[PDB]
């Protein structure tokens, strides 16, 4: 469950989390439709787009 951000995403409220391209993140789970996933980084925790991340070392 260790992942890397592919693109920049800026948080928009509703418990979303900003992520920076190249940042590593731990994934805690997904929403009903897979589109959003709950991450933790060095800057905090929150929802990020699933399509914006990929596993490390694959």
């Amino acid at each position: 469950n260790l992942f890397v951000a592919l693109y920049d995403f800026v948080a928009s409220g509703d418990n979303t989390l900003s992520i920076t391209k190249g940042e590593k993140l731990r994934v805690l789970g997904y929403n009903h439709n897979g589109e959003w996933c709950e991450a933790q980084t060095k800057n905090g925790q929150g929802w990020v787009p699933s399509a914006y991340i990929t596993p490390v070392n694959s």
Partner: peptide, 10 residues
């Protein structure tokens, strides 16, 4: 999670 759509990859 948010009810709205996430933004498309840039």
């Amino acid at each position: 999670a948010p009810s709205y759509s996430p933004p498309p990859p840039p």
